[PDB]
Design an enzyme around this catalytic site. Structure first.
Site, PDB file in Angstrom:
ATOM      1  N   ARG A 175       7.777   1.843 -14.984  1.00  0.00           N
ATOM      2  CA  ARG A 175       6.974   3.658 -14.700  1.00  0.00           C
ATOM      3  C   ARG A 175       7.910   4.103 -14.072  1.00  0.00           C
ATOM      4  O   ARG A 175       8.002   3.992 -12.749  1.00  0.00           O
ATOM      5  CB  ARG A 175       6.191   2.946 -14.470  1.00  0.00           C
ATOM      6  CG  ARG A 175       4.921   1.318 -13.583  1.00  0.00           C
ATOM      7  CD  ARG A 175       3.842   1.209 -12.813  1.00  0.00           C
ATOM      8  NE  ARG A 175       3.205   0.373 -12.908  1.00  0.00           N
ATOM      9  CZ  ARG A 175       1.923   0.008 -12.208  1.00  0.00           C
ATOM     10  NH1 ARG A 175       1.742   1.054 -10.904  1.00  0.00           N
ATOM     11  NH2 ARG A 175       1.492  -1.277 -12.757  1.00  0.00           N
ATOM     12  N   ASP A 187       4.949  -1.401  -2.901  1.00  0.00           N
ATOM     13  CA  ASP A 187       4.209  -0.345  -3.830  1.00  0.00           C
ATOM     14  C   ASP A 187       5.161   0.407  -4.705  1.00  0.00           C
ATOM     15  O   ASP A 187       6.527   0.234  -4.826  1.00  0.00           O
ATOM     16  CB  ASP A 187       3.178  -0.149  -2.780  1.00  0.00           C
ATOM     17  CG  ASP A 187       3.096   1.377  -3.096  1.00  0.00           C
ATOM     18  OD1 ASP A 187       4.232   2.413  -2.707  1.00  0.00           O
ATOM     19  OD2 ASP A 187       2.714   2.104  -3.237  1.00  0.00           O
ATOM     20  N   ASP A 192       4.635   8.442  -6.445  1.00  0.00           N
ATOM     21  CA  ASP A 192       3.699   8.451  -7.373  1.00  0.00           C
ATOM     22  C   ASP A 192       2.905   9.753  -7.227  1.00  0.00           C
ATOM     23  O   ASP A 192       2.650  10.590  -6.285  1.00  0.00           O
ATOM     24  CB  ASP A 192       2.299   7.430  -6.108  1.00  0.00           C
ATOM     25  CG  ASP A 192       2.320   6.300  -6.489  1.00  0.00           C
ATOM     26  OD1 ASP A 192       3.549   6.192  -5.387  1.00  0.00           O
ATOM     27  OD2 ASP A 192       1.732   5.771  -7.368  1.00  0.00           O
ATOM     28  N   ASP A 204       4.065   4.106  -0.335  1.00  0.00           N
ATOM     29  CA  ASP A 204       4.904   4.561  -1.117  1.00  0.00           C
ATOM     30  C   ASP A 204       6.214   5.368  -0.676  1.00  0.00           C
ATOM     31  O   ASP A 204       5.151   5.735   0.678  1.00  0.00           O
ATOM     32  CB  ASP A 204       4.554   5.377  -2.054  1.00  0.00           C
ATOM     33  CG  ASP A 204       3.884   6.488  -2.276  1.00  0.00           C
ATOM     34  OD1 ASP A 204       3.714   6.749  -0.864  1.00  0.00           O
ATOM     35  OD2 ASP A 204       2.837   6.927  -3.273  1.00  0.00           O
ATOM     36  N   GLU A 243       0.832  -1.355  -0.350  1.00  0.00           N
ATOM     37  CA  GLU A 243      -0.343  -0.208   0.132  1.00  0.00           C
ATOM     38  C   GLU A 243       0.917   1.106  -0.173  1.00  0.00           C
ATOM     39  O   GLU A 243       0.108   2.338  -0.446  1.00  0.00           O
ATOM     40  CB  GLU A 243      -0.868   0.353   1.568  1.00  0.00           C
ATOM     41  CG  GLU A 243      -1.532   0.886   0.740  1.00  0.00           C
ATOM     42  CD  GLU A 243      -3.106   1.310   0.246  1.00  0.00           C
ATOM     43  OE1 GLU A 243      -3.935   2.252   0.499  1.00  0.00           O
ATOM     44  OE2 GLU A 243      -3.674   0.379  -0.185  1.00  0.00           O
TER      45      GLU A 243
END
Length: 361
Positions: A241, A184, A188, A144, A142
């Site tokens: 990513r 995770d 983000d 970052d 969950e």
């Protein structure tokens, strides 16, 4: 407290989205009472309690977000590990070893947070002590290292290093017969956030790295936002990513991507992810991917439900590449700021690598 670093008062560079539609100055206007030197998590949260008041928080040494007490479960980790950075804040590391461990730095615009500078600090990705199982995907973590969300805007991330550090994925255990994924994302940027610049930073050893734009129910509100500029950064041993974007508009130039398509832990998949309504303008980037043939250069970019991607002057394993035929549509929106894109030579790639990350400001 005293301002050790005069460099702390510096604002974001003229280049980059963090300097468009306003400037990112962080806490440059802080009064002496709002200039701090913190050595532990308690002092850190105390300084952050200054709210929207301009503040400069100087990080000395390693800050253990867990305060020395391991998280006992999800609720506990959720309750103690997410540290919110308020508006008009400059978090700057002192020296070569300013570091954060066991937590996440959150820039949440839900309370109006904006104008934040995170600089010269190392953030080790947190380990989720209680991953949740997802039907059809397995264990999912969950937390970052850093999350910019809910409309936060004007954020400058400079000379920051994010890495799995002391706990790499090859150290994952298994639970109920499935790989117990405890990491995770790394960085983000989502939910209407905008005007961000990421420079001179390093993301090292990590799987799912930078997701810009999240698959949410009312995502149309991301349209025309999430503008992010990334330059002179290093993405080393990162699986994928870098970034994968939906709705946002990314300008990635003169960055260094180093990996191995046969890496035993962080097997390179792709760098740029083109998701729904996302666009990426790649210029003069350096890709050094072991075991990746020049005949498969298009593999550095992956198409999801998006289409816009353009590259100009990038190089893969020492040779220039032409990705115009990779199956993407042209990036046409004009970059509003002046910027210096240099030819990607061996020397430039080396210089970028030598200067990227925390402890090098």
């Amino acid at each position: 407290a005293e301002l050790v670093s005069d460099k702390a008062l510096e604002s974001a560079p003229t280049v980059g989205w963090a300097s468009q539609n306003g400037f990112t100055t962080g806490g440059a206007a802080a009064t002496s009472d709002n200039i701090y030197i913190v050595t532990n998590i308690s002092e850190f949260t105390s300084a952050l309690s200054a709210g929207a008041e301009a503040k400069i928080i100087q990080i000395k040494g390693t800050i253990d977000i867990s305060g020395g007490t391991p998280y006992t479960d999800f609720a506990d980790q959720k309750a103690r590990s997410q540290i919110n950075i308020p508006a008009n804040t400059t978090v700057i590391g002192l020296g070569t070893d300013a570091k954060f461990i066991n937590g996440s730095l959150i820039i949440d615009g839900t309370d109006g947070t904006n104008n934040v500078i995170i600089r010269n600090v190392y953030i080790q990705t947190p380990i989720d002590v209680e991953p949740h199982y997802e039907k059809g995907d397995g264990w999912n973590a969950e937390w970052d290292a850093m999350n910019i969300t809910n409309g936060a805007h004007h954020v400058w991330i400079d000379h920051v290093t994010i890495s799995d550090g002391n706990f790499t994925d090859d150290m994952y255990t298994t639970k109920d017969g499935e790989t117990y994924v405890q990491h995770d994302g790394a960085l983000d940027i989502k939910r209407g956030s905008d005007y961000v610049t990421i420079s001179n930073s390093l993301i090292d050893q990590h799987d799912k790295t930078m997701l810009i734009g999240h698959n949410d129910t009312n995502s149309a509100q991301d349209k025309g936002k999430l503008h992010v500029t990334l330059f002179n950064n290093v993405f080393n041993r990162v699986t994928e990513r870098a970034p994968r974007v939906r709705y946002g508009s990314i300008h990635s130039f003169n960055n260094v991507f180093k990996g191995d398509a046969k890496d035993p832990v962080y097997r390179y998949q792709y760098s740029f992810g083109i998701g729904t309504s996302g666009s990426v303008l790649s210029e003069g980037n350096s890709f050094t991917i072991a075991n990746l043939s020049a005949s498969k250069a298009c593999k550095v970019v992956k198409k999801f439900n998006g289409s816009i991607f353009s590259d100009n002057g990038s190089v893969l394993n020492g040779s220039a590449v032409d990705l115009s035929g990779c199956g993407f549509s042209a990036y046409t929106s004009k970059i509003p700021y002046i910027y210096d894109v240099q030819p990607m030579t061996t020397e430039l790639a080396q210089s970028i690598t030598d200067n990227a990350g925390s402890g090098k400001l």
